[PDB]
Design a protein around this nucleic acid. Sequence first.
DNA 1: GCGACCTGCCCCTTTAAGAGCACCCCCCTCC
DNA 2: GGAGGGGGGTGCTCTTAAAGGGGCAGGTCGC
Lengths: 379, 379, 154, 303, 303
Amino acid sequence: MSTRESFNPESYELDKSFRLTRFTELKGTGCKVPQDVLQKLLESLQENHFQEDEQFLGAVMPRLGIGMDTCVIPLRHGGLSLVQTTDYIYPIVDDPYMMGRIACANVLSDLYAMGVTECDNMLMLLGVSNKMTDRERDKVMPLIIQGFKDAAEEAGTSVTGGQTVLNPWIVLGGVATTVCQPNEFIMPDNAVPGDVLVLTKPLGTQVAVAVHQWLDIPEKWNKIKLVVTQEDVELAYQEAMMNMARLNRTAAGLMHTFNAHAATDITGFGILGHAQNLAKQQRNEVSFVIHNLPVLAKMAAVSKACGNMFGLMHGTCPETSGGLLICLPREQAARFCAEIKSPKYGEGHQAWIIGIVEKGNRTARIIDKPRIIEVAPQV
Amino acid sequence: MSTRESFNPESYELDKSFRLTRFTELKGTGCKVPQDVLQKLLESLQENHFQEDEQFLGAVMPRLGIGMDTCVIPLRHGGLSLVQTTDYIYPIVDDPYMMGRIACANVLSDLYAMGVTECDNMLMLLGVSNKMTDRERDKVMPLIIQGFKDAAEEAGTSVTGGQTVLNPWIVLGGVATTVCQPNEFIMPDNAVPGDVLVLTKPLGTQVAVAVHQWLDIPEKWNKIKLVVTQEDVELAYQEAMMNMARLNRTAAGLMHTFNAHAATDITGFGILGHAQNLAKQQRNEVSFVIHNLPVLAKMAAVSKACGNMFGLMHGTCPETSGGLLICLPREQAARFCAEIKSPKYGEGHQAWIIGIVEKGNRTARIIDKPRIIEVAPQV
Amino acid sequence: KKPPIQYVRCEMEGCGTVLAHPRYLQHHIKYQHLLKKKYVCPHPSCGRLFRLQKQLLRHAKHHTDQRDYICEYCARAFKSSHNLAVHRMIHTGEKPLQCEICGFTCRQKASLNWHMKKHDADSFYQFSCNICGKKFEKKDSVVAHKAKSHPEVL
Amino acid sequence: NSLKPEEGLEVWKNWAQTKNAELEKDAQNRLAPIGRRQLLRFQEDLISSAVAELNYGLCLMTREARNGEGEPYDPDVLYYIFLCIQKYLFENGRVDDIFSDLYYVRFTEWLHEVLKDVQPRVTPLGYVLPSHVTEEMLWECKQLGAHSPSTLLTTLMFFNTKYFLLKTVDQHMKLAFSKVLRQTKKNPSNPKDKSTSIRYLKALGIHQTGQKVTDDMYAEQTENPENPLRCPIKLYDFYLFKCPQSVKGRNDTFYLTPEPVVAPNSPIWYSVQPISREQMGQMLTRILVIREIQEAIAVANAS
Amino acid sequence: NSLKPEEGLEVWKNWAQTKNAELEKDAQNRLAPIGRRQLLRFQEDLISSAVAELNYGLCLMTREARNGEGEPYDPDVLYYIFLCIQKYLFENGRVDDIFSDLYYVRFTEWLHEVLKDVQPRVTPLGYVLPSHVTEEMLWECKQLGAHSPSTLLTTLMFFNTKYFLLKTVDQHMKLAFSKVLRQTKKNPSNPKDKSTSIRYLKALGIHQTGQKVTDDMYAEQTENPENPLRCPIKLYDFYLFKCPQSVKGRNDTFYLTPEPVVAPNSPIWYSVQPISREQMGQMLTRILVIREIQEAIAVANAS
DNA sequence: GCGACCTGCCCCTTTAAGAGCACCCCCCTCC
DNA sequence: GGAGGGGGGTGCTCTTAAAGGGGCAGGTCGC
Ligand SMILES: [Zn+2]
Ligand SMILES: [Zn+2]
Ligand SMILES: [Zn+2]
Ligand SMILES: [Zn+2]
Ligand SMILES: [Zn+2]
């Protein structure tokens, strides 16, 4: 099933009317309808008054790590820190095998944000849809496990453990944990004026996914035909699938090499959503500006047709296993992308300089008229 | 809040017909609608063939830990081990604070099943029901978060981080993690003939919780109005809510003190289901046999009257935040229960010896006519 | 032909019993609260008064010595099927019952009652026979003691 | 000290370098037991080594440990090197006991295979070659004492083989708790003497019957006030005080299997199950390489 | 002399016992800055102490050391003790640099406070007392060399003060990349012309109307081929090979702030942002107590 | 002074017997 | 034809008390 380039529901003794995405209610705004309320809840569960303790009368680094993702917790033994992340997404891709890889990669995007390049253990959560027929389960769930474990193996870890629950929508998840020394991870708070931002993956996969789900039903496809041809949905869908399944492991290794002040993952809240969070945790008085957005090919046009559901040009487009958003000095950034594009071992990918960093009030924002780069699909 | 006797929705200015359990689709089989299906799925999640590695030419300790729970992962530096778990509980109690406390205790139990009395870190999962009034969401999630954090506080830890997602049902969970030395946890593969099994919490929480949702339906209530009145149903509900919120930290401490061999957490599946899973780990050729079944007041009768919906007697009734199932030598067990009944350190709690460890081929069972040690309703 | 399973209750004062089918209610009421009669055992000296026809048939076996139950292993005889069933446990070497404090396993509740003397528990018990204050825990055991001991006959 | 951890660390470093060179020249894939996907390469430092990697590494040293000149180590100095490694591990935050912990059982078996055929060497002009291991050396490595159930059991074995003159495994296996009797034997001349000693009948084969001499036929252990932590009677009483009441008063076996899980305040450390002949032999054969015991048994048999 | 890490650990242990006694005495509520809810207790052993605990303890020690029995140490000795602690941490697996790592910024400030008011320890025969800290002591530790960017910066500052004779921070600030020049001066050995040297403006005096001074009025830094890792020049070339390209050629600054994130193969270590004045002062004060430099400046005043 | 023998009393287990429910079997039935 | 009621007898699980064998502990006689 790994070598196969696509999915054939009939070949697995299943009716072709079987869509993995049928088990979730895809909404244009993404997995979570509200962001501020959801962000308020996440802050509430990340907020502990006793955690400050007047900075222990010393220089104490945050126990919430980034403050918004990938908490770092000191240990009692050998001055070690426990870095761990978690993120659960629902099926967004028809292919069952590739879906597990996406779930694994998403769970590690937050871990590669802090700079950790290796992981020790990796659990998972596998929710089985009660609406799923029993015979379908025996030939759909195993592929998810296969892909999840293959992605973990490629990440340099073993999926040891897990959990199974019954839930009306397929819930894919996991927690990645690393026990690393202080000299192996990057705390993202050293952003300084005069630094540029780098994005490792093209933005706007949710648009391609939604457009591909709409492809079958004509109650919504008819209008989109005028702006974009149907064939362009398939190629963009393939590119989004492939990109979401490639790990940021190479990117994490290069952050150490090229003096990365800060980094984060564009996952679930949008490039603007996670730029504000990143800029809210810079100890200096610095703000971020996004002068560019590398949208996936011919998805920007479809974004405008329905500006409310997607809202890509404005930046608040949810993403699933997006790239890292680093803050490098201009001199190094020119070399960061050059190295990542053409690695020695192979399997390279492009990266863009989306914007610049200037003195501000610890908040990010997109210029009124950002430029959109149509990243040519690989083929 | 813990101090308040109960939860009155009008105190928070919500609708009187608001029951937190309304969101979940409760069933007699509960979250484990099929058990064999989810047993196989959990096994698949924890399946790893390369771990044998020619046995490392020796008695290499197993990485999966209990094989099915609390996987232990050796680390590169320090000679330490990573001991972490995860569990997800849907709401079953009308008190959101107590429900969050129960969720945290359930997540933590699997650490205590291996004699880990201290947890370094804990994450969280906070599902948000779609079919939940946005006004209600603001008055409930703070209570659930407060309960989770209070339960973590009572466990000598602090929840820092997590993830917030939207699901049709409220989903609560966590990831308890610990980095501890080999002299801090217990590997449950040391059972020997002549041992006795000790249970720290009474069974039947599922039945009492489910019945409370029938206290409103006149159709379902009339079925069991003869067996059990309403007042004792309320007593059983209160106690199953209070018992499900305790912590097994004292159990783990006295487990280390009194030469315990193996232990496991009765969460889901059933007391027999967990014992059978436990028996498959033992190096020795042993077989458990359960001769008693502690149960709350007036719960076996309801299990009889409700047909195969629950199945207490056969030990297939799934449980939430169930107590440990320890394996001690006789004299320690005799001393074990007396001390846990009157621990000078804290508050009293009972424990029952429910079986013996006969010699067999790694399987458990229940005698044809087991006894029911009715657990007085805290009187 | 098994009737669908419901539950009913006799409303007689002091009768809190519940029957697993509507059919059994009339049998219960007749045989407990209505069918009031006295019978004297045919044996000259037994002198025990029984109120049911059925009880006499069993009591006939008590005075006679027509054993019919033969153990499979030791070929011993017994006066009742359940007696033999209990006896079979010895050869099979099974000890199902188990005290929940000290894990002392036995083969009958007679032994388990003796063990409970150790783990002092008569204080928790509330029931007691009005004749000699036997201090029981449940109610059916009270009738058992009134039958075996403190008999009410002639 | 008379025990030098630096020697153990150096020996381990040399062996690890050799083994890593062998693995890298072989260039055949192999994965370490640790969770992270890493190629198996023995840490040149002992401390970072995993529990499973130590067991495999230490086992090989018994067949592949060389010295600076290249001559393979003799059994006595090899046991001494392993004691040095244990001291090193205890000094650097580790807690595993490479001789008693269950995960290290294979290492003990290989060590016993090494030490099985050890006999005194008279090659030096001196008619006796003093072994490098010593009583105070083990006491320093925490192998003897009330530290843990296994070490305590070994300590009792050490004091029996020294005083009672029990050398063969069969002799210990004949030893039972009932036979070992403790008496006050307080001497009224010495006020508040509070004397104590454990006495055991000897299995001396002679035609004559009866008690010819009380002292000749019964060995005793003498209280040692110099270090109460070394007194055989203090370790013996502490042994019984940490044993189930059931075994006491029995006449079958004296050494009890350690419980896998114990705590500093656990009332009972041992299980009623006696130790098997394999473990008994492994413990004894190691306790028959010390120099104190060797010369003590030398004295007894000659006279 | 050399370093004695055990003595530093002894100082830490004494201070830890005293501070834990005080903590128990006050009977307040204070929580350790770790994941577990454990009351703050300063580990009697350094290695198992978190970064926050280590920072806080090191700060209080400079006031509460009382290392001498009833006697506190002079500012010179404290530097020796903390160098010993750093060596102990290096030797025991830790990766903490208590001097330059950004997490310990609070500590270094306190040492600067204690040391800035240097009071020479004079004797009737004159203040010829050489401090207990020496160049070999810093180089035995990781402070001076080319291991981390901060160590490289302090090594360059050390060499500047030891050969160019820069005795105050203001003198240092005046130095810039363009001012220093690499000269491949002809060596006395004709066949070998390889060695170079770096010179800086010094004793420039007054340039009024082209006032004539000796064409050689600078202080050189010749090669030291005894150890390639100590050479003044190789470290200068290494430094300029790690600084950002744009920095070179300017006259604004010489000492560059190191990037917080660095890797062994990182092509550029520093950032254009020049070092702060307070950082100049702290590094200078820490580098000025070393006995060797005192002699270097001592000869200058004499001559 | 120490033991063997007889006998008394308590301990714990096994056999004997009652209580009541669930069940089957037969018969009858008026709709 | 018929499912439901009436009448009768019966096995099974639970419970308790009575009988009984084993063993600890006295008093008496002998060595
Ligand atoms: Zn009635
Ligand atoms: Zn009769
Ligand atoms: Zn029989
Ligand atoms: Zn008991
Ligand atoms: Zn009575």
